[PDB]
Design a protein around this ligand. Structure first.
Ligand SMILES: Nc1ncnc2c1ncn2[C@@H]1O[C@H](COP(=O)(O)OP(=O)(O)O)[C@@H](O)[C@H]1O
Ligand SMILES: Nc1ncnc2c1ncn2[C@@H]1O[C@H](COP(=O)(O)OP(=O)(O)O)[C@@H](O)[C@H]1O
Ligand code: BEF
Ligand SMILES: [Mg+2]
Ligand SMILES: [Mg+2]
Lengths: 361, 361
């Protein structure tokens, strides 16, 4: 009998193998501390192994033998550089964007913010600005441009029917979701489990995409979970709550020894709460990529409703050639001085004629 | 002897059958934990059954036998998917509106926010902006367009005489009311009971329609009831009180297995308190419909006093055909630029000539 799951090591030295729901389930498989020490297994490690029905007085199946860890033969787990000791460097492998149903979005993103491997990016938009739809387009583009990259879609505290829509429209990539009906406890648990899985995969030199809608809601759950920390930060935030979201996002990095962790998350702003603004400014100092969306552009029904002037990445030269670098610099200079909605309107009109490369030509 | 009511399960595993007043009554019928276990009854379930006079030393009549649960035989109770387990989808069945005493209002709403089954909608207006009268029009229009839909009206913390007006104007559709004379505890209890009833009916695939005036007042009661939660959001809002209103509203959804829960509620804004505005922005992120009414349009006595540009839904394509989609897109493009009051004036003048479908022609 074969069982599979993702390792979750408890406090007692033994662990369980989880399902896609990322929660304790009746079918989880027991993993003894002996096996964990035997294979240097770590939280989030994907374990596949033959198991047996539980004996009498046993409520969960026990993993008799470990077969594959993170899809590989487990000796390599013993002698590998730990994810935490991997050298972080800047995103050195740009990732072109193109999605057929709306490739305006992909070309505009590419012209506004290049994506590499190890990207620590954020999209900052008010509610109802295509934020979620842009995330969908990016997911589709990645699953066409980088099929090799494990694309993980994490949805925290968001709308269930949107969860269904992405699950259906992601063409099978790992969609982990926890709707707003769930308490922040569920959100934090699922997010951390997915995060650990991603770090374990990257520890195997893997390139991982995490499309995290509502990182702000994740921070909200973190604050709701932070037990006191004492004083209150301006806006209602807690001083020690944002440490966990900060670490969570900062995990995204490029590795010199193989693999990359790229987390692209969606940020809410212009929400009337100092809390949201403080979270945004706190995360911007950690991220390498920002794309700002304008509420007014959406109000005019101009899509993608991007605020071009505020958008950009850091170290684009590492993701773009000199010709492309000068092209983008020219484009920003031309558009820098002038109004947002008009900017998107003529950018769309000019890019609509042809693909971006010819739009240059 | 027969009795009927709605099931309210106590902490001790037994329950009582309630009347329309949605509270403890002397006439409530005891329900043993047994019957609940056999019939798998749940809170809000409507139970009808032959009862007996209570024995000596008994204060409440006891349900000797269960005959029907939610108007259907008890067997289906044992084998049915739980409401929490129902797959949510987008509102896929538009509900077209009309009320004879004001077809202007209903047709403008249809042109501004088409309604589907499972709609999580909201109308946002300052005090004295027709929100109550508009809700009255919607109640009347639904009781003419969708008699099949169980029309439940919930009036929380609102003017009593308006309650009574709705009583003789709702034409018998279930209305559960709790004026501002009641404490917030009564509001919370009654709202939760009605909510559970609605979920239980939809669990039987029923299309349930909930018109909730004073949802902001419901949130006020939630905040007043929340025992501490420690910190406070800007404007005086509690950090954890709003979870319950959020879950309450998010219950509204479209079920892919049949039935729907469509909740439309009245929101108060421009009230001079950060609290109402924070509530509005927070529920806007959960609702799939917003219809904005302008105080100035009321002050000019122009009705309905709708702010067209701010009003709109999400996924209209699922509720309207392509011709209607293009028509409304054209109408907004034309109306996008015009002043609120004057835009409404021109709209009313044009639509007054004919039924909306001929106004298209
Ligand atoms: N590129 C687009 N094309 C068509 N509609 C869009 C586009 N972007 C946004 N919208 C509309 O805006 C609404 C909100 O977009 P969404 O991204 O889901 O919200 P948010 O930006 O707050 O996550 C959607 O219902 C959608 O119809
Ligand atoms: N369509 C309308 N036609 C005539 N009078 C209206 C209309 N809408 C609102 N009003 C007037 O505005 C006042 C406030 O309306 P209502 O929505 O019932 O109260 P509130 O908006 O303060 O809850 C009422 O006294 C009513 O006479
Ligand atoms: F309305 Be957005 F999705 F926050
Ligand atoms: Mg969204
Ligand atoms: Mg009112």
């Amino acid at each position: 009998r074969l069982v599979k799951g993702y390792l979750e090591i408890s406090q007692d030295g033994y662990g369980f193998l989880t399902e896609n729901l990322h929660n304790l389930e009746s079918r989880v498989a027991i993993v003894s501390a002996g096996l964990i020490k035997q294979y240097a297994l770590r939280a989030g490690d994907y374990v596949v192994g033959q198991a047996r029905p539980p004996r009498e007085n046993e409520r969960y199946a026990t993993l008799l033998k470990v077969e594959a860890v993170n899809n590989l033969d487990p000796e390599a787990a013993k002698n590998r550089p730990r994810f935490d000791e991997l050298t972080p460097q800047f995103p050195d492998r740009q990732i072109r964007l193109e999605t057929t149903p709306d490739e305006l979005s992909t070309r505009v993103i590419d012209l506004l913010a290049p994506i590499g491997r190890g990207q620590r990016g954020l999209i900052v938009a008010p509610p109802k600005a295509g934020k979620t739809t842009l995330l969908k387009k990016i997911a589709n583009a990645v699953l066409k441009n980088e099929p090799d990259i494990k694309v993980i879609v994490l949805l925290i505290d968001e709308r269930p029917e949107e969860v269904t829509d992405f699950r259906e429209s992601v063409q099978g990539a790992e969609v982990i979701a926890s709707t707003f009906d769930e308490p922040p406890q569920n959100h934090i648990r699922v997010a951390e489990f997915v995060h650990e899985r991603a770090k374990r995969i990257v520890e195997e030199g893997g390139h991982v995409m995490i499309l995290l809608d509502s990182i702000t809601r994740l921070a909200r759950a973190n604050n709701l979970v932070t037990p006191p920390t004492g004083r209150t930060l301006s806006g209602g935030l807690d001083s020690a709550a944002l440490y966990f979201p900060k670490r969570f996002l900062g995990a995204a990095r490029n590795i010199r020894g193989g693999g990359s962790l790229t987390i692209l998350a969606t940020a809410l702003v212009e929400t009337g709460s100092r809390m949201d603004d403080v979270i945004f400014e706190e995360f911007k100092g950690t991220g390498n990529m920002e794309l700002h969306l304008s509420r007014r552009l959406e109000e005019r029904r101009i899509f993608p409703a991007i605020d071009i002037l505020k958008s950009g990445t850091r170290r684009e030269e590492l993701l773009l050639g000199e010709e492309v670098t000068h092209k983008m610099w020219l484009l920003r200079k031309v558009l820098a001085d002038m109004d947002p909605a008009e900017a998107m309107e003529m950018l769309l009109a000019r890019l609509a004629r042809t693909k971006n490369n010819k739009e240059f030509l």
